Symmetry: D2
Subunit: 31 residues, 4 copies
């Protein structure tokens, strides 16, 4: 549970940031 991950790239973060927020919303909307 919970796996910290650091990346030297703000660009990749923006991507993973959208995938993380988009993946969490699917669970709340889908259940």
């Amino acid at each position: 549970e919970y796996f910290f991950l650091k990346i030297r790239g703000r660009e990749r973060f923006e991507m993973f940031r959208e995938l993380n927020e988009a993946l969490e919303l699917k669970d709340a909307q889908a259940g």
Copy 2:
């Protein structure tokens, strides 16, 4: 630069983990 990103999930993390390692490889092939 280094931006932390708490990823809770084996698949989700594996995604950003594979995307991070895959993105770094492109730099070697491209420049």
Copy 3:
């Protein structure tokens, strides 16, 4: 302007399939 992309792989396509469905549902929330 549609850009057909022949995804080679069940996992690869499944990935973009989840990113496409999540990006489409997320866009509805914004505008």
Copy 4:
């Protein structure tokens, strides 16, 4: 397997395009 997906997003497509080319390059080195 070869799947066919139609992406109506310039940015979204570029993502899967970079993810498919990056995931295909890493798979070639292993497989």
